[PDB]
PDB file of C-alpha atoms and ligand atoms in Angstrom:
ATOM      1  CA  UNK A  13     -45.441 -30.655 -16.402  1.00 25.11           C
ATOM      2  CA  UNK A  14     -42.693 -29.770 -13.935  1.00 25.12           C
ATOM      3  CA  UNK A  15     -39.192 -31.136 -14.480  1.00 23.47           C
ATOM      4  CA  UNK A  16     -36.521 -32.504 -12.163  1.00 26.21           C
ATOM      5  CA  UNK A  17     -35.029 -29.858  -9.863  1.00 25.04           C
ATOM      6  CA  UNK A  18     -32.209 -30.767  -7.484  1.00 23.67           C
ATOM      7  CA  UNK A  19     -28.904 -29.327  -6.305  1.00 21.38           C
ATOM      8  CA  UNK A  20     -26.484 -29.391  -9.244  1.00 21.03           C
ATOM      9  CA  UNK A  21     -23.391 -27.428 -10.238  1.00 20.28           C
ATOM     10  CA  UNK A  22     -24.107 -24.488 -12.546  1.00 18.82           C
ATOM     11  CA  UNK A  23     -23.664 -25.114 -16.281  1.00 18.96           C
ATOM     12  CA  UNK A  24     -19.992 -25.061 -17.166  1.00 21.49           C
ATOM     13  CA  UNK A  25     -19.045 -25.970 -13.607  1.00 21.90           C
ATOM     14  CA  UNK A  26     -17.423 -23.804 -10.972  1.00 22.36           C
ATOM     15  CA  UNK A  27     -14.357 -21.618 -11.203  1.00 22.49           C
ATOM     16  CA  UNK A  28     -10.855 -22.803 -10.354  1.00 24.17           C
ATOM     17  CA  UNK A  29     -10.078 -23.346  -6.681  1.00 21.34           C
ATOM     18  CA  UNK A  30      -6.641 -22.440  -5.360  1.00 21.12           C
ATOM     19  CA  UNK A  31      -4.926 -25.121  -3.310  1.00 19.36           C
ATOM     20  CA  UNK A  32      -1.165 -24.668  -3.822  1.00 20.49           C
ATOM     21  CA  UNK A  33       0.919 -23.420  -0.927  1.00 19.99           C
ATOM     22  CA  UNK A  34       1.553 -19.676  -1.228  1.00 20.12           C
ATOM     23  CA  UNK A  35       4.290 -18.382   1.108  1.00 17.87           C
ATOM     24  CA  UNK A  36       5.869 -15.512  -0.852  1.00 18.72           C
ATOM     25  CA  UNK A  37       9.330 -14.195  -0.021  1.00 21.99           C
ATOM     26  CA  UNK A  38       9.315 -10.648   1.350  1.00 24.10           C
ATOM     27  CA  UNK A  39      12.883 -10.230   0.175  1.00 23.29           C
ATOM     28  CA  UNK A  40      16.055  -8.763   1.612  1.00 24.31           C
ATOM     29  CA  UNK A  41      19.527 -10.234   1.227  1.00 26.23           C
ATOM     30  CA  UNK A  42      21.561 -11.093   4.293  1.00 22.99           C
ATOM     31  CA  UNK A  43      24.224  -8.695   3.048  1.00 21.12           C
ATOM     32  CA  UNK A  44      21.768  -5.789   2.969  1.00 22.31           C
ATOM     33  CA  UNK A  45      20.360  -6.537   6.425  1.00 20.86           C
ATOM     34  CA  UNK A  46      23.836  -6.835   7.943  1.00 20.37           C
ATOM     35  CA  UNK A  47      24.889  -3.620   6.197  1.00 20.21           C
ATOM     36  CA  UNK A  48      21.875  -1.736   7.562  1.00 22.92           C
ATOM     37  CA  UNK A  49      22.679  -2.994  11.053  1.00 23.26           C
ATOM     38  CA  UNK A  50      26.332  -1.996  10.810  1.00 24.71           C
ATOM     39  CA  UNK A  51      25.436   1.396   9.358  1.00 22.95           C
ATOM     40  CA  UNK A  52      23.044   2.264  12.158  1.00 25.87           C
ATOM     41  CA  UNK A  53      25.660   1.076  14.662  1.00 29.28           C
ATOM     42  CA  UNK A  54      28.255   3.381  13.091  1.00 27.38           C
ATOM     43  CA  UNK A  55      25.862   6.334  13.122  1.00 28.80           C
ATOM     44  CA  UNK A  56      25.104   5.739  16.796  1.00 28.55           C
ATOM     45  CA  UNK A  57      28.808   5.478  17.602  1.00 25.70           C
ATOM     46  CA  UNK A  58      29.548   8.784  15.865  1.00 24.28           C
ATOM     47  CA  UNK A  59      26.687  10.578  17.619  1.00 23.11           C
ATOM     48  CA  UNK A  60      27.772   9.243  21.009  1.00 25.64           C
ATOM     49  CA  UNK A  61      31.358  10.277  20.263  1.00 25.15           C
ATOM     50  CA  UNK A  62      30.383  13.899  19.714  1.00 26.98           C
ATOM     51  CA  UNK A  63      27.921  14.027  22.614  1.00 24.07           C
ATOM     52  CA  UNK A  64      30.297  12.442  25.130  1.00 21.53           C
ATOM     53  CA  UNK A  65      33.115  14.800  24.156  1.00 21.95           C
ATOM     54  CA  UNK A  66      30.741  17.718  24.726  1.00 18.99           C
ATOM     55  CA  UNK A  67      29.791  16.202  28.088  1.00 21.75           C
ATOM     56  CA  UNK A  68      33.464  15.974  29.070  1.00 18.42           C
ATOM     57  CA  UNK A  69      33.897  19.664  28.261  1.00 20.20           C
ATOM     58  CA  UNK A  70      30.802  20.560  30.305  1.00 21.51           C
ATOM     59  CA  UNK A  71      32.094  18.541  33.259  1.00 19.76           C
ATOM     60  CA  UNK A  72      35.459  20.301  33.045  1.00 16.62           C
ATOM     61  CA  UNK A  73      33.644  23.647  33.127  1.00 17.27           C
ATOM     62  CA  UNK A  74      31.696  22.630  36.238  1.00 17.27           C
ATOM     63  CA  UNK A  75      34.909  21.425  37.891  1.00 19.20           C
ATOM     64  CA  UNK A  76      36.528  24.781  37.135  1.00 17.84           C
ATOM     65  CA  UNK A  77      33.646  26.603  38.810  1.00 21.38           C
ATOM     66  CA  UNK A  78      34.034  24.385  41.876  1.00 20.40           C
ATOM     67  CA  UNK A  79      37.794  25.009  41.956  1.00 20.91           C
ATOM     68  CA  UNK A  80      37.208  28.762  41.786  1.00 22.08           C
ATOM     69  CA  UNK A  81      34.738  28.553  44.672  1.00 23.53           C
ATOM     70  CA  UNK A  82      36.845  26.296  46.928  1.00 25.00           C
ATOM     71  CA  UNK A  83      39.050  28.859  48.781  1.00 19.82           C
TER      72      UNK A  83
ATOM     73  CA  UNK B  10       0.992 -39.897  -7.890  1.00 18.88           C
ATOM     74  CA  UNK B  11       2.904 -38.951  -4.749  1.00 18.94           C
ATOM     75  CA  UNK B  12       4.574 -35.805  -3.460  1.00 17.56           C
ATOM     76  CA  UNK B  13       7.621 -35.026  -1.316  1.00 19.76           C
ATOM     77  CA  UNK B  14       7.085 -32.655   1.602  1.00 18.52           C
ATOM     78  CA  UNK B  15      10.603 -32.311   3.032  1.00 20.69           C
ATOM     79  CA  UNK B  16      13.037 -33.272   0.277  1.00 21.51           C
ATOM     80  CA  UNK B  17      14.733 -29.904  -0.306  1.00 21.33           C
ATOM     81  CA  UNK B  18      18.499 -29.376  -0.241  1.00 23.37           C
ATOM     82  CA  UNK B  19      19.809 -26.006   1.020  1.00 19.40           C
ATOM     83  CA  UNK B  20      22.195 -24.201  -1.303  1.00 20.61           C
ATOM     84  CA  UNK B  21      25.781 -23.986  -0.065  1.00 20.86           C
ATOM     85  CA  UNK B  22      26.973 -20.856  -1.855  1.00 20.54           C
ATOM     86  CA  UNK B  23      28.234 -17.923   0.195  1.00 21.46           C
ATOM     87  CA  UNK B  24      25.128 -15.801  -0.392  1.00 23.34           C
ATOM     88  CA  UNK B  25      22.658 -18.479   0.739  1.00 24.60           C
ATOM     89  CA  UNK B  26      24.756 -19.283   3.811  1.00 23.92           C
ATOM     90  CA  UNK B  27      24.859 -15.568   4.619  1.00 23.67           C
ATOM     91  CA  UNK B  28      21.077 -15.366   4.196  1.00 23.66           C
ATOM     92  CA  UNK B  29      20.545 -18.237   6.629  1.00 21.58           C
ATOM     93  CA  UNK B  30      23.010 -16.637   9.054  1.00 23.70           C
ATOM     94  CA  UNK B  31      21.100 -13.354   8.832  1.00 23.98           C
ATOM     95  CA  UNK B  32      17.891 -15.251   9.552  1.00 24.01           C
ATOM     96  CA  UNK B  33      19.508 -16.852  12.604  1.00 21.73           C
ATOM     97  CA  UNK B  34      21.044 -13.659  13.975  1.00 23.66           C
ATOM     98  CA  UNK B  35      18.305 -11.125  13.143  1.00 20.82           C
ATOM     99  CA  UNK B  36      15.136 -13.226  13.689  1.00 18.97           C
ATOM    100  CA  UNK B  37      13.485 -12.620  10.329  1.00 17.87           C
ATOM    101  CA  UNK B  38      10.877 -15.395  10.459  1.00 17.27           C
ATOM    102  CA  UNK B  39       9.916 -14.528  14.035  1.00 16.06           C
ATOM    103  CA  UNK B  40       9.227 -10.977  12.863  1.00 13.51           C
ATOM    104  CA  UNK B  41       7.223 -12.429   9.969  1.00 12.25           C
ATOM    105  CA  UNK B  42       5.001 -14.370  12.371  1.00 14.76           C
ATOM    106  CA  UNK B  43       4.580 -11.281  14.530  1.00 16.69           C
ATOM    107  CA  UNK B  44       3.581  -9.456  11.356  1.00 15.84           C
ATOM    108  CA  UNK B  45       0.854 -11.941  10.510  1.00 12.84           C
ATOM    109  CA  UNK B  46      -0.564 -11.730  14.026  1.00 13.81           C
ATOM    110  CA  UNK B  47      -0.510  -7.920  13.820  1.00 10.90           C
ATOM    111  CA  UNK B  48      -2.254  -7.912  10.448  1.00  8.31           C
ATOM    112  CA  UNK B  49      -4.781 -10.347  11.768  1.00  6.89           C
ATOM    113  CA  UNK B  50      -5.637  -8.098  14.731  1.00 10.20           C
ATOM    114  CA  UNK B  51      -6.693  -5.337  12.320  1.00 11.45           C
ATOM    115  CA  UNK B  52      -9.686  -7.194  10.870  1.00 12.93           C
ATOM    116  CA  UNK B  53     -13.248  -7.756  12.012  1.00 14.31           C
ATOM    117  CA  UNK B  54     -13.802 -10.374  14.738  1.00 15.31           C
ATOM    118  CA  UNK B  55     -16.116 -13.286  14.002  1.00 15.42           C
ATOM    119  CA  UNK B  56     -18.025 -13.021  17.285  1.00 16.66           C
ATOM    120  CA  UNK B  57     -21.805 -12.685  17.216  1.00 14.97           C
ATOM    121  CA  UNK B  58     -23.702 -10.902  19.984  1.00 15.63           C
ATOM    122  CA  UNK B  59     -25.543 -13.727  21.686  1.00 14.43           C
ATOM    123  CA  UNK B  60     -28.331 -13.803  22.881  1.00 17.70           C
ATOM    124  CA  UNK B  61     -29.320 -10.788  20.786  1.00 12.44           C
ATOM    125  CA  UNK B  62     -27.917 -12.527  17.694  1.00 14.57           C
ATOM    126  CA  UNK B  63     -28.292 -16.222  16.926  1.00 17.93           C
ATOM    127  CA  UNK B  64     -26.281 -18.706  14.903  1.00 16.92           C
ATOM    128  CA  UNK B  65     -27.700 -19.827  11.567  1.00 16.19           C
ATOM    129  CA  UNK B  66     -29.892 -22.916  11.530  1.00 14.50           C
ATOM    130  CA  UNK B  67     -31.861 -24.784   8.865  1.00 12.21           C
ATOM    131  CA  UNK B  68     -35.299 -26.393   8.478  1.00 12.74           C
TER     132      UNK B  68
HETATM  133  C1  PEE C   1      32.164  -3.432  12.957  1.00 13.06           C
HETATM  134  C2  PEE C   1      31.964  -3.639  14.457  1.00 13.06           C
HETATM  135  C3  PEE C   1      30.496  -3.802  14.830  1.00 13.06           C
HETATM  136  C4  PEE C   1      30.319  -4.369  16.237  1.00 13.06           C
HETATM  137  C5  PEE C   1      29.746  -5.784  16.220  1.00 13.06           C
HETATM  138  C6  PEE C   1      28.270  -5.814  15.834  1.00 13.06           C
HETATM  139  C7  PEE C   1      27.915  -7.030  14.973  1.00 13.06           C
HETATM  140  C8  PEE C   1      26.519  -7.573  15.282  1.00 13.06           C
HETATM  141  C9  PEE C   1      26.130  -8.724  14.355  1.00 13.06           C
HETATM  142  C10 PEE C   1      25.404  -9.848  15.092  1.00 13.06           C
HETATM  143  C11 PEE C   1      24.527  -9.316  16.222  1.00 13.06           C
HETATM  144  C12 PEE C   1      23.242 -10.122  16.382  1.00 13.06           C
HETATM  145  C13 PEE C   1      22.994 -10.517  17.834  1.00 13.06           C
HETATM  146  C14 PEE C   1      21.554 -10.237  18.260  1.00 13.06           C
HETATM  147  C15 PEE C   1      20.967 -11.410  19.046  1.00 13.06           C
HETATM  148  C16 PEE C   1      21.468 -12.745  18.489  1.00 13.06           C
HETATM  149  C17 PEE C   1      21.070 -13.923  19.379  1.00 13.06           C
HETATM  150  C18 PEE C   1      20.562 -15.091  18.537  1.00 13.06           C
HETATM  151  O1  PEE C   1      20.615 -15.018  17.361  1.00 13.06           O
HETATM  152  O2  PEE C   1      20.051 -16.234  19.165  1.00 13.06           O
HETATM  153  C19 PEE C   1      19.241 -17.035  18.355  1.00 13.06           C
HETATM  154  C20 PEE C   1      17.970 -17.411  19.109  1.00 13.06           C
HETATM  155  O3  PEE C   1      17.202 -16.261  19.320  1.00 13.06           O
HETATM  156  C21 PEE C   1      15.843 -16.546  19.468  1.00 13.06           C
HETATM  157  O4  PEE C   1      15.309 -17.251  18.688  1.00 13.06           O
HETATM  158  C22 PEE C   1      15.043 -15.970  20.637  1.00 13.06           C
HETATM  159  C23 PEE C   1      13.591 -15.691  20.248  1.00 13.06           C
HETATM  160  C24 PEE C   1      12.609 -15.927  21.399  1.00 13.06           C
HETATM  161  C25 PEE C   1      11.194 -15.473  21.034  1.00 13.06           C
HETATM  162  C26 PEE C   1      11.018 -13.962  21.195  1.00 13.06           C
HETATM  163  C27 PEE C   1      10.564 -13.290  19.899  1.00 13.06           C
HETATM  164  C28 PEE C   1      11.156 -11.889  19.769  1.00 13.06           C
HETATM  165  C29 PEE C   1      11.185 -11.408  18.322  1.00 13.06           C
HETATM  166  C30 PEE C   1      10.329 -10.167  18.127  1.00 13.06           C
HETATM  167  C31 PEE C   1      11.158  -8.889  18.110  1.00 13.06           C
HETATM  168  C32 PEE C   1      11.909  -8.651  19.412  1.00 13.06           C
HETATM  169  C33 PEE C   1      12.466  -7.236  19.502  1.00 13.06           C
HETATM  170  C34 PEE C   1      13.760  -7.171  20.307  1.00 13.06           C
HETATM  171  C35 PEE C   1      14.275  -5.745  20.474  1.00 13.06           C
HETATM  172  C36 PEE C   1      13.435  -4.921  21.447  1.00 13.06           C
HETATM  173  C37 PEE C   1      14.097  -3.584  21.772  1.00 13.06           C
HETATM  174  C38 PEE C   1      13.756  -3.082  23.173  1.00 13.06           C
HETATM  175  C39 PEE C   1      20.053 -18.259  17.928  1.00 13.06           C
HETATM  176  O5  PEE C   1      19.512 -19.443  18.456  1.00 13.06           O
HETATM  177  P1  PEE C   1      19.089 -20.631  17.397  1.00 13.06           P
HETATM  178  O6  PEE C   1      18.561 -20.003  16.136  1.00 13.06           O
HETATM  179  O7  PEE C   1      18.015 -21.493  18.008  1.00 13.06           O
HETATM  180  O8  PEE C   1      20.405 -21.558  17.038  1.00 13.06           O
HETATM  181  C40 PEE C   1      21.543 -21.464  17.854  1.00 13.06           C
HETATM  182  C41 PEE C   1      22.324 -22.777  17.752  1.00 13.06           C
HETATM  183  N1  PEE C   1      23.087 -22.827  16.518  1.00 13.06           N
END
């Protein structure tokens, strides 16, 4: 009547099983990374140049007010 | 059949040397590891709520 029934793989077997190492490269050349670093450094230098010159002018103004008040 | 695990030879052209120098000076692989840990924080934990939940058993 009944037939044999035990744990077996399904007909045709199972699907493929990945085992190879997969460490993909995100990707950015050393030249590009160094260029981005240098570019942001240059932008910061320019911004600080303008701001510190403005600060010098403000300090000179404050010094002038003090000089006017001294006598 | 046998495999080699550590038998690679780094390229000595200017671009590859510059890439390795950028890795040394800008910590690219350290940021990559930080990135995996960050990604891994944003997924569901595997913890079950014992004793209100129980681990699977069998007959
Ligand atoms: C045109 C003029 C421009 C002016 C000059 C500017 C040029 C700048 C170009 C180079 C600057 C890069 C320097 C930055 C730091 C470099 C230091 C460094 O590279 O040290 C590493 C080592 O550095 C480390 O590995 C330390 C890591 C410790 C673990 C901490 C992980 C931190 C990484 C996550 C991100 C951290 C964020 C930092 C910024 C936070 C901001 C508040 C080298 O050591 P080794 O690879 O072992 O080999 C040396 C022997 N040959």
